[PDB]
Structure 1
Amino acid sequence: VGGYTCGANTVPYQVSLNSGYHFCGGSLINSQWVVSAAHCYKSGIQVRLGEDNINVVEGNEQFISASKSIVHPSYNSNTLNNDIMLIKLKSAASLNSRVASISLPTSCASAGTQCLISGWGNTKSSGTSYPDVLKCLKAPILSDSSCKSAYPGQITSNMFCAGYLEGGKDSCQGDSGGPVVCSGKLQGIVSWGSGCAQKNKPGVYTKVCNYVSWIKQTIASN
């Protein structure tokens, strides 16, 4: 896995989901909701906002319990199709410079476009920071071909790939459910893959522009 140390609080809509330790990432959608992967679903979530070193209290955090989890109704855990969940917060977050929502898309993104991918630990440890500090990596949306060819028979409509066609770039763990953001919109969710620094295996992401109406409705229904 590649990318670097992001900068404490440079990705204000990043969340940590903690069940007594960090187990998945997510994104603040509005002061009462988060989105993350379905794969990440579990009972007993605490949502940590404003983190950087998840192992230290450094002053900015907000810890809020989740009060409700909605996994997408046609989520399939064998193929990971529709891998997204909404998390409603027991309380509202106060938003301020370090803790901020991120906007949903109006449009889907174009291959070629360059995004930010945020999250803790791949797994590694020492590149620069900490499995402990938030890390970042920038990488382009790939073509569908490229993606499909990378994983034949597995990619659906609700996915895209991104990164580098090899020795190009891969995250690794701890990062399921975290954001992929391109020109200021949440266009992705970290979902699976089988790469990081393996070969030319991209990651695969849940294609958020697909699920905008679900999210808005649901959220407003809950």
Structure 2
Amino acid sequence: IVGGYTCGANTVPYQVSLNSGYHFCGGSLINSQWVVSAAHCYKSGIQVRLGEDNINVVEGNEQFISASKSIVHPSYNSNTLNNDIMLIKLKSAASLNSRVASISLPTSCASAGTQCLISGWGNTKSSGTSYPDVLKCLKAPILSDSSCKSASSRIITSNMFCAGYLEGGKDSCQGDSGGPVVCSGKLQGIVSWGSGCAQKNKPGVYTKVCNYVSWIKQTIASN
């Protein structure tokens, strides 16, 4: 997260860290046994870490649970990042409490101009590298498709939306992938991609979760 602020320990209870010996992506707890993340974060031997703030210090509220199954969207295209969403099932159900809680799926798509909360342990510099140990937060509005279908160099399908600032300076970044974008109290997006970080006229692109609710519900009901 570039240009954000320190969230504060466990203030984003649904945020998860995907660990394969080190933190490599974020995710969101949607219920006691399922996590939603980005398909491009797929990897074998994933351990889900809940109740995290400082990912390098055991603080007492963590829950480490291995993944038993990973399901990448059936139409994921790794070249265009279309349908960049994946479901991860935990080997055992997490214990939900004040510091570990699920985030609700949307019933309608968020409107342009709506302010959202993006969080993650990703790079905090637009130029160079510096990874934080504690969770960072960013307030960012959803931009009109017009505002980036002309700003984005790659293809922006109807399964993505842009959020951020055209002036640059504030944006999600490497290591934030798979993380949540929450607007109106529901999970509206997944950190997917962008051109560099916090670059002018290059806002972040996010997976539009509202278009995947049917698939998510059907999958979790049968797995």
**Fold shared per TM-score above 0.5:** yes
Counterpart in the other structure of 1:107? 108
Q: Do 2:76 and 2:82's aligned partners in 1 also have CA atoms closer than 8 Å? A: yes
How far apart are residue 121 of structure 1 and its match? 2.3
From the superposition, tell whether residues 126 and 148 of structure 1 become closer, same or farther in structure 2 (CA, over 3 Å).
closer
Alignment deviations for residues 135-170 of structure 1 (CA, whole Å, 9 cap, x no partner): 000000000001201125610010000000122522
Q: Extract unaligned runs of 5+ from structure 1.
A: none
Counterpart in the other structure of 1:181? 182
Give aligned pairs, total. Answer: 222
Q: Do 1:165 and 1:200's aligned partners in 2 also have CA atoms closer than 8 Å? A: yes
SS at match of 1:117: strand
From the superposition, tell whether residues 159 and 57 of structure 1 become closer, same or farther in structure 2 (CA, over 3 Å).
same
From the superposition, tell whether residues 153 and 22 of structure 1 become closer, same or farther in structure 2 (CA, over 3 Å).
closer
Identity %: 98
How far apart are residue 197 of structure 1 and its match? 2.9
SS at match of 2:69: strand
Structure 1 segments, 4+ long, off by >4 Å, are 125-130
Q: How far apart in 2 are the matches of 1:3 and 1:13?
A: 18
TM-score (norm 1): 0.96
Q: How far apart in 1 are the matches of 2:151 and 2:102?
A: 33
Q: Do 1:189 and 1:206's aligned partners in 2 also have CA atoms closer than 8 Å? A: yes
Alignment deviations for residues 66-120 of structure 1 (CA, whole Å, 9 cap, x no partner): 0000000000000000000000000000000000000000000100001000100
Output the aligned Cα RMSD. Answer: 2.0
Counterpart in the other structure of 2:120? 119
Q: How far apart in 1 are the matches of 2:184 and 2:97?
A: 21
Counterpart in the other structure of 2:202? 201
From the superposition, tell whether residues 112 and 87 of structure 1 become closer, same or farther in structure 2 (CA, over 3 Å).
same
Q: Do 1:32 and 1:93's aligned partners in 2 also have CA atoms closer than 8 Å? A: yes
SS at match of 2:150: helix
SS at match of 1:47: strand
